[PDB]
Scaffold this active site. Structure first.
Site, PDB file in Angstrom:
ATOM      1  N   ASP A 149      77.207  87.357  17.639  1.00  0.00           N
ATOM      2  CA  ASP A 149      76.131  88.144  17.045  1.00  0.00           C
ATOM      3  C   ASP A 149      76.692  89.317  16.250  1.00  0.00           C
ATOM      4  OD1 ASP A 149      73.443  89.306  16.656  1.00  0.00           O
ATOM      5  OD2 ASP A 149      72.896  88.032  18.358  1.00  0.00           O
ATOM      6  N   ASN A 208      63.287  81.954  12.930  1.00  0.00           N
ATOM      7  CA  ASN A 208      62.051  82.723  13.001  1.00  0.00           C
ATOM      8  C   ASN A 208      61.184  82.487  11.770  1.00  0.00           C
ATOM      9  OD1 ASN A 208      63.192  83.795  15.367  1.00  0.00           O
ATOM     10  ND2 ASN A 208      64.108  85.505  14.244  1.00  0.00           N
ATOM     11  N   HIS A 237      71.329  94.380  17.607  1.00  0.00           N
ATOM     12  CA  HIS A 237      70.936  92.992  17.827  1.00  0.00           C
ATOM     13  C   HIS A 237      71.833  92.323  18.861  1.00  0.00           C
ATOM     14  CE1 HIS A 237      68.903  89.356  17.201  1.00  0.00           C
ATOM     15  NE2 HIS A 237      68.767  89.381  15.888  1.00  0.00           N
ATOM     16  N   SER A 249      65.959  84.278  18.390  1.00  0.00           N
ATOM     17  CA  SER A 249      67.260  84.866  18.673  1.00  0.00           C
ATOM     18  C   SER A 249      67.275  85.609  20.000  1.00  0.00           C
ATOM     19  CB  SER A 249      67.660  85.811  17.537  1.00  0.00           C
ATOM     20  OG  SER A 249      66.526  86.460  16.979  1.00  0.00           O
TER      21      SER A 249
HETATM   22 CA   LIG Z   1      70.533  89.254  19.656  1.00  0.00          CA
END
Ligand SMILES: [Ca+2]
Ligand SMILES: [Ca+2]
Length: 279
Positions: free
Chosen positions: A39, A161, A69, A224
């Site tokens: 990530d 998404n 994130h 995610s």
């Molecule tokens: Ca993430």
């Protein structure tokens, strides 16, 4: 073991019904298993990781997670309050920059790296990889995700998404890996969730509370965020000797929660991740 007042995503994986708030898991909590988190990296100094998080590679210039994130999804894998494999070893590979962007060449090189450095680590129960990125279709990142899965790693990737068929997105449309859709609090399909025959399992992906950079915690929703639920579940399951990285995804689908989700399009699976733990 049993964690009271858990995030709804943790409790849902340990449940046959939605609405529960207690997360039930085996005391092993996925110890001896490793989960590579591909990530924006991980803030290893977070008290929720407890020395179990580690930055092993950066494809930029700094191992910092200046986005939040990657620290959030790594928290869902195996942090203290928000992780499903609470005792796993978290390795942070930083293919996404502090803006959440990332070239396919960098994402590919990150998957090629995990398959090699896997042999330099102590993961007796096995190894997992959670790729909660997602871009347009690519034959080469689909190929890179398959190389990671073929090398002996359980690969969990985000469905995307986009509220469309995940067959147009990478590495989601790779058949070898585990494509993870997102479900919400009421066992509906998340309004952003991708669908299609490519998906192998669904996870809690809406309002997922987890860790964040700066020692904080916040909720963000996306496939995610559903992917780390399956990454930690596969890790937690391989520690039990119940499954193998080569078939953790199929084992999760066999022992999932069948037909509980709504808004599932025709041709898409209706399976919700379920650890089947019974105290
Ligand atoms: Ca993430
Ligand atoms: Ca089904």
């Amino acid at each position: 073991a049993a964690q009271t007042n858990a995030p709804w995503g943790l409790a849902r994986i340990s449940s046959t019904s939605p609405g529960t708030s207690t997360y039930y898991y085996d005391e092993s909590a996925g110890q001896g298993s490793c989960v590579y988190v591909i990530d924006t990296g991980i803030e290893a100094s977070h008290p929720e990781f407890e020395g179990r998080a580690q930055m092993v590679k950066t494809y930029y210039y700094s191992s910092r997670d200046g986005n939040g994130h990657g620290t959030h999804c790594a928290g869902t894998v195996g942090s203290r309050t928000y992780g499903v494999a609470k005792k796993t070893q978290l390795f942070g590979v930083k293919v996404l920059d502090d803006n959440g962007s990332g070239q396919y060449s960098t994402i590919i090189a990150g998957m090629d790296f995990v398959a090699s450095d896997k042999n330099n680590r102590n993961c007796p129960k096995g190894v997992v990889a959670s790729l909660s990125l997602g871009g347009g279709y690519s034959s080469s990142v689909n190929s890179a995700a398959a190389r990671l899965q073929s090398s002996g790693v359980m690969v969990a990737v985000a469905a995307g998404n986009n509220n469309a068929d995940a067959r147009n997105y990478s590495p989601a449309s790779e058949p070898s890996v585990c494509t993870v859709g997102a479900s919400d609090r009421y066992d509906r399909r998340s309004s952003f969730s991708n669908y299609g025959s490519v998906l192998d399992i669904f996870g809690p992906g809406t309002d997922i509370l987890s860790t964040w950079i700066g020692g904080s915690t916040r909720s963000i929703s996306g496939t995610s965020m559903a992917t780390p639920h399956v990454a930690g579940l596969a890790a937690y399951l391989m520690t039990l000797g119940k499954t193998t990285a080569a078939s953790a995804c199929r084992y999760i689908a066999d022992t999932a929660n069948k037909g509980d989700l709504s808004n599932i399009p025709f041709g898409t699976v209706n399976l919700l991740a379920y650890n089947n733990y019974q105290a």
